[PDB]
Design a binder for these strands. Sequence first.
DNA 1: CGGGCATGCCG
DNA 2: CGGGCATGCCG
Lengths: 132, 130, 133
Amino acid sequence: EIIWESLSVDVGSQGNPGIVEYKGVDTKTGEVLFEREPIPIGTNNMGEFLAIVHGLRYLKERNSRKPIYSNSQTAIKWVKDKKAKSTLVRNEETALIWKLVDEAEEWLNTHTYETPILKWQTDKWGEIKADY
Amino acid sequence: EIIWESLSVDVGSQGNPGIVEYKGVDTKTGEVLFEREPIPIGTNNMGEFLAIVHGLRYLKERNSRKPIYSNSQTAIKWVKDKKAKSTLVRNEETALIWKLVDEAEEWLNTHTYETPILKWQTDKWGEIKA
Amino acid sequence: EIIWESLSVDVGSQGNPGIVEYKGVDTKTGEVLFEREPIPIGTNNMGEFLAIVHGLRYLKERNSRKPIYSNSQTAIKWVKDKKAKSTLVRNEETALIWKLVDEAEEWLNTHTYETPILKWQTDKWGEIKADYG
DNA sequence: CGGGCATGCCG
DNA sequence: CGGGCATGCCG
Ligand code: NA
Ligand code: NA
Ligand code: NA
Ligand code: NA
């Protein structure tokens, strides 16, 4: 069953690697709760990872334990392992997204949380609420 | 829990793509109920697909409602989708395996079967029978 | 059923990537017909590829129409494609294996042959006669 | 498509 | 075990 009192996150991207952005929304109402403006170079998995950790921090700051939904098997695993295993080259052109990933990993390594991170079941429920 | 009153299918593959064979067994006895003679070139997933559909036909012909276990989540989806989304090249040397896939796909598009198709949970239960 | 009047090839490696060697033997008698001394760094699949192409050339110069057996379906396909699809980095340490693979591809791309390259069916026939152990 | 993943013979 | 080779959801 869908947990309606939850937050849903999703990446939007052009190419992969390419321009990436993400947002987090109320799973029921669609209210946009946070967003990340387009990053010129990134990968889908890096964006999905940042989006979950942003939701974790958003909810922690508000003393909320409600679940987060993502449709990214890879990003959910990366968050559980506290390590984003991206193959994207790290240089001056990718320094932005790599710094954001560094900071997300740092947050996960320095905080605990009860937030359930749940797989959105696209085949059953249709597109995730935060889809672009 | 393991539904013991079932069939289990397994595929044997010498490389991938490569020589492929399969069989269906009684989950509780290991009796071999049907088998496919080696196929010169196929993929593991095509073997698993064909093995499921063979078991579906075998069970329907016996008016059996036993489930089928497969270790292959991909082939289970293919059968539920009625379409084997294989990347194997269609040419003269793979004609046989693709012929067999097309016949199985035929059979799925004209029958609505009773058989539950279950994933064998090797990580908990050990190797699928044979 | 086995074509006993044939060549069988096999590869021995220590590590992967690692030290690679290979040999070709008379399937019927077990006699070593050719053997490649240790190559310091290569992959198993590159070694299996080189061994088949060595067999092709060995049979061609001996005016032989005998087939080759290999237990590597990967290397059989690579030979069929005339391309060894190895991921091994090209650098100074891998220069020798890559030179050999590049020369083997050149030979395949400039020569025709009728030699059947056949899959040795280990689980059904036992260990290939050229096995290292 | 690419990104990463799940899953499929040899040292 | 891990690594070289493969067959196979989401933007
Ligand atoms: Na997504
Ligand atoms: Na998502
Ligand atoms: Na396969
Ligand atoms: Na190899």
